[PDB]
Design a binder for these strands. Structure first.
Ligand SMILES: N[C@@H](CCC(=O)N[C@@H](CS)C(=O)NCC(=O)O)C(=O)O
Ligand SMILES: N[C@@H](CCC(=O)N[C@@H](CS)C(=O)NCC(=O)O)C(=O)O
Lengths: 236, 236
DNA sequence: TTGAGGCATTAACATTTGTTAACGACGATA
DNA sequence: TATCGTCGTTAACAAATGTTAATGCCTCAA
């Protein structure tokens, strides 16, 4: 992306150099209250939350370039306690102090509008996801998540659309769709397989019937069409 | 609150005058995508979405002052096809075309930071809502919505906490929690009534065991503590 | 006073999902 | 080689939830 590159050159120009993170490494966490402005430049991360009981919840993934806020810009208080775990092998991200961000965006308006637009992307994303997950229950939740991962990490292959993700354990899918037990998600997956919707090959997932997921995730497909059209046309 | 008043005067200085809307009246709609930037100054509204089969989905409410984006500020494209129905008797809102917002914000930076902060409140809200509703299924979703309504529209009474909403039918809660049929909502509400959690009196809902809802909506309570701390202190 | 329609409560069945357990395939270690 | 853990299936049983129908309470219009 161009806006992302200009943003990079701006940050670096203002003495803000990137940091490197490895897999299983947290950029910020839900226990230390350090309000940051993460500009995930390269890599893949997952935003997670752990309850008092210890239950994990995968709220979303982030694939650079994108912006993640852990604190408000005016009050400089916390927007919510979450972790951002690196799940790719390596990732490069620009950690910015919450106070300096205001000084940086005040100076340049283009980059300001870039951050604003990434924010809108977050909003619309969350609304669509909430819709498609809420209506059709857990089957619809799984289907929606598969749609997201297929548009973001999917590549056409002889047998279908291969989702290029190193770790996609049943536990992870459950964490992304509010399912606590791997057996249940394994059952839903078994149904989808039997309906000739997906295949489990090479420890990976191959999506062969995209329309089936489109039915259970209308607002998500619509969203990718209205906000990530470059990512949407690669499969249409 | 106050930043919204300064924002009001700002809008009334650039020739952007408020428009009035009555109950059930829509400001923008899904089928006629004109990209606006609604600044709900006063009143209560609800953001809804209708599938192709007619299924309704209540994504959330909006009690002024707040900001709603129907289109992106850069691309000027729709962020998603949603409707905004007024559910209060009367509501005052400033309608702004999306192309004007970029200049109007470029002119003043404090109000830019206001809209930005409100958008961050939207983000945190959606994330917390997604986590709680998702973790404990439909019971937890009902508890979450009830907590939200209790913080935003609740007022302490000797009978508990009165949710000052005229129209809060079983079907409306269902739409707010992804439940299609009113009978199921009635069933859950009956369980809570038996559990000494709430009571249905004077055509309104009264909350007596806030903690019970806090258990099923931890991230939402956290959100009210972090994003709307006054609304949170009003009940603690 | 009557009748229609909408909303709430409940019951009864079907479908889905939660929860635990057993079995087998796989990798890794010694 | 054997042994231990982890993950994917499947089964069996319980709880939740989807779905429909019946009933009663209320308002409203004639
Ligand atoms: N950098 C890309 C992708 C940014 C990104 O990661 N967006 C989030 C939503 S705000 C996403 O697609 N997440 C995918 C997921 O949740 O797995 C863009 O500009 O849209
Ligand atoms: N103006 C009030 C309320 C703004 C508002 O409506 N915020 C949304 C969250 S983005 C909300 O609380 N919605 C409650 C609901 O969904 O009923 C404030 O800023 O605290």
């Amino acid at each position: 992306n161009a806006q992302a590159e200009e943003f990079k050159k701006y940050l670096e120009t203002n003495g803000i150099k990137p940091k490197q993170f490895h897999k299983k490494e947290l950029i910020f966490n839900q226990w230390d209250p350090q309000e940051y402005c993460i500009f995930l430049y390269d890599g893949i991360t997952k935003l997670t939350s752990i309850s008092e009981n210890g239950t994990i919840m995968n709220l979303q993934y982030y694939k650079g370039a994108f912006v993640i806020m852990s604190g408000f810009i005016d009050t400089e208080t916390s927007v919510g306690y979450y972790n951002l775990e690196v799940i790719s092998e390596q990732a490069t991200a620009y950690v910015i102090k919450i106070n300096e961000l205001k000084e940086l965006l005040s100076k340049n308006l283009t980059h300001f509008f870039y951050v604003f637009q990434t924010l809108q992307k977050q909003v619309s994303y969350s609304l669509a996801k909430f819709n498609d997950f809420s209506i059709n229950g857990k089957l619809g939740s799984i289907c929606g998540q598969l749609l997201i991962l297929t548009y973001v990490y999917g590549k056409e292959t002889p047998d279908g659309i291969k989702i290029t993700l190193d770790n996609l354990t049943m536990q992870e899918l459950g964490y992304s769709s509010g399912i606590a037990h791997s057996s249940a998600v394994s059952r839903i997956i078994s149904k989808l397989k039997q309906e000739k919707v997906i295949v489990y090959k090479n420890s990976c997932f191959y999506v062969q019937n995209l329309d089936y997921l489109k039915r259970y995730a209308p607002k998500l497909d619509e969203w990718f069409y209205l906000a990530c059209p470059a990512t949407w046309g690669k499969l249409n």
